[PDB]
């Protein structure tokens, strides 16, 4: 069950200065980057173009190229359309994609955030506001929904293009998605909380537990998954223990990259 994400972030400083940058993920591996400075989108994998032709892709890019410019002036206008009710600096984010299921089933989304909070989504055949949204946003929504061209285009990308493209992206990048990377573990302690550092493992599902032989230690405190530049995962597990009980306790690791041979390292 994979989730595909296009991520946009635009900042409008004042009435004349702004920028817009984007990035694209399949699950936890990055597929595209589009800088504000760059006139074209970039691939960050060899298989980023999925099963799309060169012509197909170049069409799709040009659409977006136009979009970026349009979108800038539009936000700026929509400010004039509020003011003095609204004011700079303004921060906008959009998250859009489709999440894949068994068979042919998928569900697409387009989610917008104004000034850090989620306010607008595209749903069905038009833009709507979500619960919690400030009322004044109704007027913009009304203008956005006035534009039938845009609506058409957006339904198409969300209904058809996204899934089709991901189904194709999933084939062309299966090697990297199903790639297995073996975790490297080391221990230490700080004034005593003992740490089991795990680093370099892929995919992200992992099982890390402290053991006294076979007694599964319940005082084990798992951290957050942090990334490494080479696109592997780092995690750590801390155990709060009394002085002396260092010798004996060991860290056990379950991962698909090992294949039955569990990492086990003793203090």
């Amino acid at each position, epitope marked *: 069950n994979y989730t595909f994400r296009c991520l946009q972030m635009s900042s409008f400083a004042n009435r004349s200065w702004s920028r817009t940058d984007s990035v694209v993920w399949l699950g936890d591996l990055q597929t595209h980057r589009w800088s504000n400075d760059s006139a074209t989108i970039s691939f960050t994998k060899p298989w980023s173009q999925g099963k799309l032709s060169n012509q197909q892709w170049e069409k799709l890019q040009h659409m977006f190229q*136009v979009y970026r410019v*349009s979108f800038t002036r*539009d936000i700026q*206008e929509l400010v004039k*359309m509020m003011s003095p009710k609204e004011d700079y600096p303004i921060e906008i984010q959009l998250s859009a994609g489709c999440e894949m299921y068994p068979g042919n089933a998928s569900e697409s989304f387009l989610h917008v955030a104004f000034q850090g909070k989620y306010v607008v989504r595209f749903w069905g055949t038009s833009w709507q506001t979500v619960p919690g949204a400030p009322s004044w946003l109704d*007027l913009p929504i009304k*203008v956005l929904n*006035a*534009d*039938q061209g845009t609506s058409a285009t957006v339904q198409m990308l969300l209904n058809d293009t996204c899934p089709l493209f991901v189904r194709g992206l999933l084939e062309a990048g299966k090697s990297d998605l199903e790639k297995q990377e073996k975790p490297v573990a080391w221990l230490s302690s700080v004034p005593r909380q003992l740490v089991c550092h795990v680093s370099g493992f892929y995919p992200k599902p992992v099982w890390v537990m402290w053991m006294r032989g076979d007694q599964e230690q319940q005082g084990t405190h798992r951290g957050d998954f942090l990334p490494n530049a080479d696109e592997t995962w780092y995690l750590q597990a801390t155990l709060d223990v009394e002085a002396g009980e260092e010798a004996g306790l060991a860290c056990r690791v379950k991962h698909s990259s090992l294949g039955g041979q569990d990492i086990i390292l003793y203090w």
Partner: T-cell receptor
Framework: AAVTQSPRNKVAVTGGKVTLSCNQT?????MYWYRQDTGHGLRLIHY???????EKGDIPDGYKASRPSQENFSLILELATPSQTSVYFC??????????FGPGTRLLVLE | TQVEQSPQSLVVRQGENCVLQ??????????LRWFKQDTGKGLVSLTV?????DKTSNGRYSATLDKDAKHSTLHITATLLDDTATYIC?????????????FGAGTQLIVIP
């Protein structure tokens, strides 16, 4: 969808003060001031998204605009010059694209 | 001036047909509209074209739009004396109030009675 202008025709003097006025009873949020000159299409001077707002257009220099209310939009030449001799169109419209144009106002600025 | 009209002006005999041209570079190009303007008078809309390859007709007026070519033509069938007017080409860059209109300077027609 009606748009009216007053006056329809006006003679003024360099350095004088002229007010062109536009009235719309369509409850349109949006109103726009343009000027027509030969060898040119309509160019946008000022526009407004609602009461007590004005926005600079493409050629705003020498004009100032005022939106006292939803129904009225005004173009104000404070220090009239011969170059501001033109025909002025006002229009209005809602969230759609269509703009509805007034009948025009001729202005002549003499020395 | 991303909107260019041609011919600049032309003279025809009543009952003849004529064709007027509009070529533009405006991006994007949501819709294109034709206006008739009588001397001294204001702007009467005649037609508005919206699709990628579009055709409209309104009485003796008919028009085509082709967005790939970014080109439009207005045809007047069986001109009458009242057709003596300037014809103006207008291109709007959005399909909402967020757009700006882009005006050609028009083509001057004189029908000879």
């Amino acid at each position: 969808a009606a748009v009216t202008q007053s006056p329809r025709n006006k003679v003024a003097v360099t350095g004088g003060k002229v007010t062109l006025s536009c009235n719309q009873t369509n409850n349109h949020n949006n109103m726009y001031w343009y000027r027509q000159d030969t060898g040119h299409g309509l160019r946008l001077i000022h526009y407004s998204y609602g009461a007590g707002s004005t926005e600079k257009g493409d050629i705003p220099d020498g004009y100032k605009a005022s939106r006292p209310s939803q129904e009225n939009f005004s173009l104000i030449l404070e220090l009239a010059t011969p170059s501001q001799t033109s025909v002025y169109f006002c229009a209005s419209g809602d969230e759609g694209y269509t703009q509805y144009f007034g009948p025009g106002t001729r202005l002549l600025v003499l020395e | 001036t991303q909107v260019e009209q041609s011919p600049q002006s032309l003279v025809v005999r009543q009952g003849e047909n004529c064709v007027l041209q509009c070529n533009y570079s405006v991006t994007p190009d949501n819709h294109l509209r034709w206006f008739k303007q009588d001397t001294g008078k204001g702007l009467v809309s005649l037609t508005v074209l919206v699709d990628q390859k579009d055709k409209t007709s309104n009485g003796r007026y008919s028009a085509t739009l082709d967005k790939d070519a970014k080109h439009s033509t207005l045809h007047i069938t069986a001109t009458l004396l009242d057709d003596t007017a300037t014809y103006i080409c207008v291109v709007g860059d959005r399909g909402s109030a967020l757009g700006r209109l882009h005006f050609g300077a028009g083509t001057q027609l004189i029908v000879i009675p």
